[PDB]
Design a protein around this nucleic acid. Structure first.
Lengths: 206, 54, 119, 122, 115
RNA sequence: AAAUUCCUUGUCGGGUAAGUUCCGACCCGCACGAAAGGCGCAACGAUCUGGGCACUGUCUCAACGAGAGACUCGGUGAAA
RNA sequence: CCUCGAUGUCGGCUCAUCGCAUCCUGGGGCUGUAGUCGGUCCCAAGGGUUGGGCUGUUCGCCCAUUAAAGCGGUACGCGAGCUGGGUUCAGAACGUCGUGAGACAGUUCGGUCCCUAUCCGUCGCGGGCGCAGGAAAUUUGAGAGGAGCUGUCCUUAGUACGAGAGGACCGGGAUGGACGCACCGCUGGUGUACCAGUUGUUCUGCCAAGGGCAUCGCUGGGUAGCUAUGUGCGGACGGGAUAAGUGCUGAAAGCAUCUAAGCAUGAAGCCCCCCUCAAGAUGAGAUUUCCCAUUCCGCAAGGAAGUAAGAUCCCUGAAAGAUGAUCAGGUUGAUAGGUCUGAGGUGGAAGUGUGGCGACACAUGGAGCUGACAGAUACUAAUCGAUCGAGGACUUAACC
C-alpha cells in the first residue's frame, strides 16, 4: 500500500487527451525520507515513519535532531507513519519519490480541513430554519431539545460549536498527472484543507 | 432565567478561583533605575533600544 | 484584511485622512496602537506617491490629503510640504518610512498608546 | 432549473402557448429538471386553433432553459428563455414542427424525431 | 505558486488564437461528433465576456438564432475549437456587455471601429 | 344552505391539475320576511371574503456584506 | 388518587428518539403460484418513508408522482424554542329561546403570547494536577460515534414458460434520485478602504481636475474570502457467527424422522472489513531520541536553590480564532507592513495636440488605478531581558 505525504499548492484545470476538462489539485511532494521502521517484534504492529520538508537548526531542537540522526539526511517538519506495507523493500534512510506512483491508480487523500470557527446550527449541521415572516421570531436557531419525560436532553443533540479543523479522507481519487523533476502529483478532484497544508496520499483500499 | 437556589460561599469561591489578574510581563530598563514592560518605552527614562525618545 | 476601528466607512476614511495629514504636519503623532498600525500603510502610500513628483501623483495626493496649513509665515500647505521636503529627504530609502513605538496604556481606557514618527 | 409551478413557452405548433409544471419526473421528490427530462404540465394558455385546448394535463419535454447545460467538454449552453415541447405517452412529439433552436442534450437520449425536426441545433 | 502553475500550464495552453477583446463579433468553428463523424459547425456572435486567466480563461459569445438568443461559453484555450476568426471589431466601453441580453433587435448596435 | 341551513363538504354548473372557502341556479326555510324594516343600489371604506396581471428571500434553499448589542481589556455597577 | 399560594389547550413550524403489531427494500414457507405480476403467513426496525388544492384543522376527499407514500408512544413529545388560524375575556350582529337582564359543544368580523439561565442536562474551548525523573515527537487500541436507502436502461433473451397476448429467476455493464463529506479550477452569488459612468447642492480663490453629503447617492462590472444552485468523491467487492427456512446421517420408537449425538448451508439484520474521536482506558499503554545524578543543612525521614534537555512571559502575524488555544516567525531573518516585478479586475487616466461653433471624438497609450493574491528585497517592526523547568522506595531472574 504505497503512500507519500506532501502539501496542497492549489487548483488547475487540465484537458485530458480530448476536449474534456479535469479539475486538478496540484500537490507538491518533495522526496520523503524514511526515519524509522516500526516492527512487530518490539512494537506489535508494522508501520513506517515518513518525514517531509526541512526545518532550520533554530527551529529544530535536540530530540528531533537525534531521532533523525539515526539515519540522517536533515531534520524533518512533518513526520507521520503508515501501516500495512511490505517491509523488505523499505529501508531506513531511503527516499521515496512521486515516481513510485503512476498516472492511472486510485488514491485515498487525507488532510486536515479548513477552519470555520465558532459557527452555529444552520451552517454546521445543514439543518433548516423557520420562517423569516408571518411574525415568526424563530430563525437561524437549533431546534427543540426533545421530549419532556426523560427530564434531560438526550446525548448527541447537534448544537452550535466549532466547525472544521478535523482530519478527513476523500476516497477513490484518481491520479491524472505525475511530474518527476518538479515533484508534483496532479489529482482529479478536490482535496481537504487550506493552501500549503499537510496532505498524505495513499493507495486506496478497493 | 431565575436562580433556583442561592450559590453557597464554597461554590462562589470555586468560581472566583479563575478571576485573578496576572503580573505584567516586566523587564529591568537598560537605562537603569526603573522597571518597564517589554517592548515599551520606559516612562521615566524615555528610552527604547537605546537613545532618547523626544 | 484591514481593521475597521469600530466606525463606519466614511468615518474611517475621514479619520485616516485627518491622521495622515496631521502626521505630515507635526512629524510625530500619538495615537492608539491600532490607529497607528492602520496609519502606517496609508502614510507610506502617500509618501511613495509624492516621491514620483509628477502632476498625476500630485492630483492623487491632493485627492487624499486635507488642506491644512503646514508652516507659519511660509504659506506652505501639507501637500507642498509632503512633496518638496519629504521627497527631498527620502530619495535614498525605499520602503519603511515609519516607526511604531509602544507606550503605556491610557488612564481612562486602558487603550495601548503608541507613537508614530517618520524616519 | 425548472421547478414545480413554472410557466414555460411552448416551442411547437401543437396549439399550446404556455404551460405550468406540476411535478418533475425522476426520483421520489425531485427539486429540479435541468434540461432534456420530461415534466408533467398543464396548458394554461392555448392557441385558439389547435389539437389541445386550455387546461388538460400533458407530459412535455424541456427543450431549452435560461440556466443552460454543462457539456462534458467544459463548454456551456445558455439560452435566453425557457421553452418545452409536448410529447404524447411515447418518445415522439405530437406537434407537426418545432420552432426555435434546440439544445444538443436531446440527442444523447433517444429524441431523434425532435432533434431532426429542429431547425437549428446548438 | 503562480510561477509554478504557469510552468505547468505553459506546455498545454494554446498559442494560435487571435487577440480579441470582449465586445466584438467573431466566429467559432467547434468540432462536434454526431455519427462518430468529425465535422465542424459554426457559431457567429458577439463576445459578451472574457474572464479568468491561464487555462482557466473562458469566453462567451451570443447569437440571435430564429427569434431566440443563444449564449455559448467556451474555455478559451481548448483543442475542440478548430479555428477562430474575427470579422468585425467593435467599439464598446464596458468590459462585460451584459445589457445585450435585455436589448434585442438592432437597439444592440455594436459600432465598428475598423481596427 | 344567507352574518340566519345542525342533516352539511345538501345537489347541478363556472373557476382550478386538484376548490369544506367563492360565484350562479333549485328550495325540505331545524329556525328569512316586510320600519328589531324587505329587496335593490351609482359613488364611498386602513371593513370582510374569492380570483388575476405586474412584482418580489414569503418560499423551494439558503449565501455574503454593513452597523448596534453579544465576545476581550480599562472605569462604574443593579435586579427578580 | 397528585397538582386550583397556577401542572398553558388543538393544529402547524424547528428538532428528533423509540416500539414492531412492517408501507418499501432483504431472506423464505403455502397457494385455487402457467413468468415480473399477486394473496396469506414466518424471520427482519439497518436505512428510507413526496409535492400541491380545500378546511383553523389533526382526519378526510381530490390532482400528479413514488420502490413506498406504515401504525403508534414520548405531558394526545416539543409555546423559560416560535406562530395564534379555531377555541376559552371585554365590542358588534344573524337564527333561536326568555316578559326581561341575558343565553346557546349554532354561526360571523375584531381581539397585548412576559423573563438578563443559578444547578443538572447537551454542544464547543481552556487552566490545574495525576501517570515512583524531566522533556520532544510517533503510535497500539479497550471503548465510543458516523455511514449504512434505492430506481431506470442495455445485455444475458422475446430465452425458459405460455397456440397467442404477455414475459422472466439467477448473472454482468452503464447511469440517475434523495441524503452525506470535501473544495472554489469552471458556472454563478456576495464582495460598504477595487475600477468606471452620472444627478443635485456645497467646498478646495476661478477654468480644467478633485473632495463632502444624499441607503455604499444611484448605476455597470468585480480581486481575496465565505459560498450552492457549481465540481470531485461516498454508501462497493467481501470475511465469521446466526434468525426464519432448506438439509445430510441417525436411533430413541427394527420403519420413518433436520434430532437427542454429530455435520452443513442460509438475511439490507449481529461482529469485523470503511471513516472519525479516543491513555483521565487512575487498568494513566508502547517505541525512538535528549539531559542525566550538581550545591548547603538535622549528618542521613527530607527540605531549599541555582541549572541541563525543553518550553514559557513579551512581540510580528494567520493557513487558526469569541477570549484563551493551535500553527507560521523573533535579527545567521521572509512573520507582517512598505518598495519593486507580476497575475487578476475595471477598462482607455491626467496634460498637451488635432478636428469641430459646441456638446464631443481621436493620438500620446491594453494607458492610468488597484483591499485582502505570489515572488524578490533587511527598508521599518518582531530589541535588550527575566521566569518555570530533573537528581529517583521492597522482592525475584541476572550482572558491576
Amino acid at each position: 500500500t504505497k503512500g507519500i505525504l506532501g502539501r496542497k499548492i492549489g487548483m488547475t484545470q487540465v484537458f485530458a487527451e480530448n476536449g474534456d476538462l479535469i479539475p486538478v489539485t496540484v500537490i507538491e511532494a518533495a522526496p520523503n525520507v524514511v526515519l524509522q521502521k516500526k516492527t512487530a517484534e518490539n512494537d506489535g504492529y508494522e508501520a513506517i515513519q515518513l518525514g517531509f520538508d526541512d526545518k532550520r537548526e533554530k527551529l529544530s531542537n535536540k530530540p528531533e535532531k537525534g531521532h533523525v540522526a539515526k539515519a540522517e539526511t536533515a531534520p524533518k517538519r512533518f513526520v507521520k507513519e503508515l501501516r500495512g506495507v511490505e517491509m523488505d523493500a523499505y529501508e531506513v534512510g531511503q527516499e521515496v519519490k512521486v515516481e513510485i506512483f503512476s498516472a492511472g491508480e486510485i488514491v485515498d487523500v487525507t488532510g486536515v480541513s479548513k477552519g470555520k470557527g465558532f459557527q452555529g446550527a444552520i451552517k454546521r449541521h445543514g439543518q433548516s430554519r423557520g420562517p423569516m415572516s408571518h411574525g415568526s421570531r424563530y430563525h437561524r436557531r437549533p431546534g427543540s431539545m426533545g421530549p419532556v419525560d426523560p427530564n434531560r436532553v438526550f446525548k448527541g443533540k447537534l448544537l452550535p460549536g466549532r466547525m472544521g479543523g478535523e482530519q478527513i479522507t476523500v476516497q477513490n481519487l484518481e491520479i491524472v498527472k505525475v511530474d518527476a523533476e518538479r515533484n508534483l502529483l496532479l489529482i482529479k478532484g478536490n482535496v481537504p484543507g487550506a493552501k500549503k497544508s499537510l496532505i498524505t496520499v495513499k493507495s486506496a483500499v478497493k | 432565567a431565575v436562580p433556583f437556589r442561592r450559590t453557597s460561599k464554597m461554590k462562589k469561591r470555586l468560581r472566583r478561583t479563575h478571576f485573578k489578574l496576572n503580573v505584567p510581563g516586566m523587564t529591568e530598563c537598560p537605562s537603569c533605575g526603573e522597571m518597564k514592560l517589554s517592548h515599551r518605552v520606559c516612562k521615566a527614562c524615555g528610552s527604547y533600544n537605546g537613545k532618547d525618545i523626544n | 484584511s484591514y481593521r475597521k476601528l469600530g466606525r463606519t466607512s466614511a468615518q474611517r476614511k475621514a479619520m485616516l485622512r485627518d491622521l495622515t495629514t496631521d502626521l505630515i504636519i507635526n512629524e510625530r503623532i500619538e495615537t492608539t496602537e491600532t490607529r497607528a498600525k492602520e496609519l502606517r500603510s496609508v502614510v507610506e502610500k502617500m509618501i511613495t506617491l509624492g516621491k514620483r513628483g509628477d502632476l498625476h501623483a500630485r492630483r492623487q495626493a491632493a485627492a487624499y490629503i486635507r488642506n491644512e496649513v503646514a508652516n507659519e509665515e511660509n504659506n506652505q500647505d501639507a501637500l507642498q510640504k509632503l512633496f518638496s521636503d519629504i521627497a527631498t529627504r527620502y530619495e535614498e530609502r525605499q520602503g519603511g518610512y515609519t516607526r511604531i513605538m509602544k507606550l503605556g496604556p491610557r488612564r481612562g481606557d486602558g487603550a495601548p498608546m503608541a507613537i508614530i514618527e517618520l524616519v | 432549473m425548472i421547478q414545480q409551478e413554472t410557466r414555460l413557452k411552448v416551442a411547437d405548433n401543437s396549439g399550446a402557448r404556455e404551460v405550468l409544471t406540476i411535478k418533475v419526473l425522476g426520483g421520489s421528490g425531485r427539486k429540479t429538471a435541468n434540461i432534456g427530462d420530461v415534466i408533467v404540465c398543464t396548458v394554461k394558455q392555448a392557441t385558439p386553433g389547435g389539437v389541445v385546448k386550455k387546461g388538460e394535463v400533458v407530459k412535455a419535454v424541456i427543450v431549452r432553459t435560461k440556466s443552460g447545460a454543462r457539456r462534458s467538454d467544459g463548454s456551456y449552453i445558455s439560452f435566453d428563455e425557457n421553452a418545452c415541447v409536448i410529447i404524447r405517452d411515447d418518445k415522439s412529439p405530437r406537434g407537426t414542427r418545432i420552432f426555435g433552436p434546440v439544445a444538443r442534450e436531446l440527442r444523447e437520449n433517444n429524441f431523434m424525431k425532435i432533434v431532426s425536426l429542429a431547425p437549428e441545433v446548438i | 505558486m503562480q510561477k509554478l502553475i504557469e510552468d505547468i500550464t505553459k506546455e498545454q495552453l494554446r498559442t494560435d488564437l487571435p487577440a480579441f477583446r470582449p465586445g466584438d463579433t467573431l466566429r467559432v468553428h467547434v468540432k462536434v461528433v454526431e455519427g462518430n463523424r468529425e465535422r465542424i459547425q459554426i457559431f457567429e456572435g458577439v463576445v459578451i465576456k472574457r474572464r479568468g486567466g491561464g487555462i482557466s480563461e473562458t469566453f462567451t459569445v451570443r447569437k440571435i438564432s430564429y427569434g431566440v438568443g443563444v449564449e455559448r461559453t467556451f474555455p478559451v484555450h481548448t483543442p475542440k475549437i478548430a479555428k477562430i476568426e474575427v470579422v468585425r471589431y467593435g467599439k464598446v466601453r464596458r468590459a462585460k456587455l451584459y445589457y445585450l441580453r435585455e436589448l434585442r433587435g438592432k437597439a444592440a448596435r455594436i459600432k465598428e471601429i475598423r481596427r
